[PDB]
Write a structure and sequence with these properties.
The complex is a heterotetramer, with two copies of chain A and two copies of chain B. Chain A is mainly beta. Chain A has four helices and 14 strands. In chain A, the strands form two sheets. Chain A has a seven-stranded antiparallel β-sheet with strand order 1-10-9-12-13-14-11, with no helix packed on it. Chain A has a seven-stranded antiparallel β-sheet with strand order 6-5-2-3-4-8-7. Chain B contains no helices and five strands. In chain B, the strands form two sheets. A three-stranded antiparallel β-sheet of chain B has the order 1-3-4, with no helix packed on it. In chain B, about 20% of the residues are buried. By secondary structure, chain B is mainly β. Classes of the chains: A mainly beta, B mainly beta. The structure holds 2-acetamido-2-deoxy-beta-D-glucopyranose (2 copies). One 2-acetamido-2-deoxy-beta-D-glucopyranose (NAG) binds next to loops of chain D. Chains A, D: This is Haptoglobin beta chain.
Chain lengths: ~240, ~70, ~70, ~240
């Protein structure tokens, strides 16, 4: 996370830190006492595209709360993870829920309206290209979907698209996706922030909801928007996978 | 227990009420109250002998982030 | 007791209800229900820790004489 | 009790059997878990008029229910037992109350209306002048007070009274007293029935009340009425003596 605020009060107990077997740090989101949401790209880090779910699980390390290790039982990739960059992690044991470890709610409403402000916490790289030592968060607004597709691709028309990504690497954009623009300065998400939740605070209920999971975390304030997976677009697959 | 005092020519029926600690909520179709019957069984009226469950509360951070 | 089963992340508060056997009646200003608090005390709301009494019933013969 | 019925169902759990130290049998009435009503003449049986309450108590034997011995703590004579033939017995222990042992209620209403039918149980002598082997009871109606005073004395006028008792011995008659005539035949109370209750069954409450305590038990069907102590006329002294 470039710029932003330090999680000094511990306001994101659903944030988890995942580490690959070659010491790359990514994010995950506790949605359950036993389950976490993350991206498929995170799970395939330091692997080949030929790896399976049973191959990936033993090579992962996962922390919640204050550097609290949690054992992983298995992972479940989304059946279409090439368009829906999502994976589910199941823990062997129910994690004990307290003020440092607590799942975020899955939303029943669609909060992904252009302009709605969400909170993104992350262990990703900072302004010095270094993995942050303490958890940071940033407030980002949902961006216009067509302007986002226009910035990272050619146009809305499929037969007119071109790369054009200011970071080179192309994000996944489709119906399951929304974008989040620059807050007000040059603060943004960056490498390692993927898997974290675009958290929305429902002031009517005073409840925090995972509206999105950060998928494209390579617009390190040199491209416009990060790209997030709509949680409402995967909620059905999530509830089915959890049981079981 | 610890043993309610006994009274002459009286008897006690034991009730118990389940509640969840932080940061959990009670998941049951009954009211959480269970009464001990003659068969050494704690019975709720009426989820039966089915005990409650304590489910974790989601999205209620103890120290939420500063508002927008 | 006999020990209500414990649930994970839950706890029990113990209640007790006093009743009199035959051929007695409950003498108390409260409702006969006593709840165990943190001080090992069974408290009624609110006769305090004052326990009930079982008083004998007068003039209710089990097999009354043949009517007039 | 001459004639009457056998207490075959055990319908008088308040009836007690008192025995003097010379084997005379009289009655007492359980009004409490620890207290019983009886007559002063019963307690002075086989004693001199000079005896006190502490003298009488150790010489008594008392049974309730089915020949169940109960220990006596003390007796309390009525302060005016020459006009109110009443004494109270206190037991050392609360008697256990069941279907064979149960106190009768003390009445809040005055049931001593001329003609009201009451039940009198008793261990007294039968038609053969023998103490009965099993408890008996008889239904008797309250008699006219003036006709009763006229039969056992001269008239209502004090300066006109004469003995005239068909049994010779005179009953105590005053304001604390009511009489009970012959039921319908020649069945009546007799020697040893004193101390028993003139029990009234309140059909409105379905509750049995001690309306009177039999004092004069010598009209063995040759005089008209037995004479009873109004329980309502001693209720205040009874409640004060019980505490304590
Ligand atoms: C995966 O992709 C196919 C595309 O043919 C779609 O029909 C299916 O529903 C998708 N599955 C989920 C769980 O979204
Ligand atoms: C006993 O007799 C006297 C008569 O002078 C009367 O005043 C008093 O109240 C009587 N006591 C009881 C308990 O009835």
């Amino acid at each position: 996370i470039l710029g932003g605020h330090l999680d000094a009060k511990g306001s994101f107990p659903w944030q988890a830190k995942m580490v690959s077997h070659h010491n790359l740090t990514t994010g995950a989101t506790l949605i359950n006492e036993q389950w976490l949401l993350t991206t498929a790209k995170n799970l395939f880090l330091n692997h080949s595209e030929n790896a399976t779910a049973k191959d990936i699980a033993p090579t992962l390390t996962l922390y919640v709360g204050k550097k609290q290790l949690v054992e992983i039982e298995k992972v479940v990739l989304h059946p279409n993870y090439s368009q829906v960059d999502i994976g589910l992690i199941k823990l062997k044991q129910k994690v004990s829920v307290n003020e440092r470890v607590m799942p975020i709610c899955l939303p029943s409403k669609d909060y992904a309206e252009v302009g709605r402000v969400g909170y993104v916490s992350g262990w990703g790289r900072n302004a010095n290209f270094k993995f942050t030592d303490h958890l940071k968060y940033v407030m980002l607004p949902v961006a216009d979907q067509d302007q986002c597709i226009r910035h990272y691709e050619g146009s809305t028309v499929p037969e007119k698209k071109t790369p054009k990504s200011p970071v080179g690497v192309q994000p996944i954009l489709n119906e399951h996706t929304f974008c989040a623009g620059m807050s007000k300065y040059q603060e943004d998400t960056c490498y390692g922030d993927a898997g974290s939740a675009f958290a929305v605070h429902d002031l009517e209920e005073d409840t925090w909801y995972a509206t999105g999971i950060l998928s494209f975390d390579k617009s390190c304030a040199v491209a416009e928007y990060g790209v997030y997976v709509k949680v409402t677009s995967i909620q059905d697959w999530v509830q089915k996978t959890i049981a079981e | 227990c610890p043993k309610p005092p006994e009274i002459a020519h009286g008897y006690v029926e034991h009730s118990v009420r389940y509640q969840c600690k932080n940061y959990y909520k009670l998941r049951t179709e009954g009211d959480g109250v269970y009464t001990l019957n003659n068969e050494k069984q704690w019975i709720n009226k009426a989820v039966g002998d089915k005990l409650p469950e304590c489910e974790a509360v989601c999205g209620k951070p103890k120290n939420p982030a500063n508002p927008v």
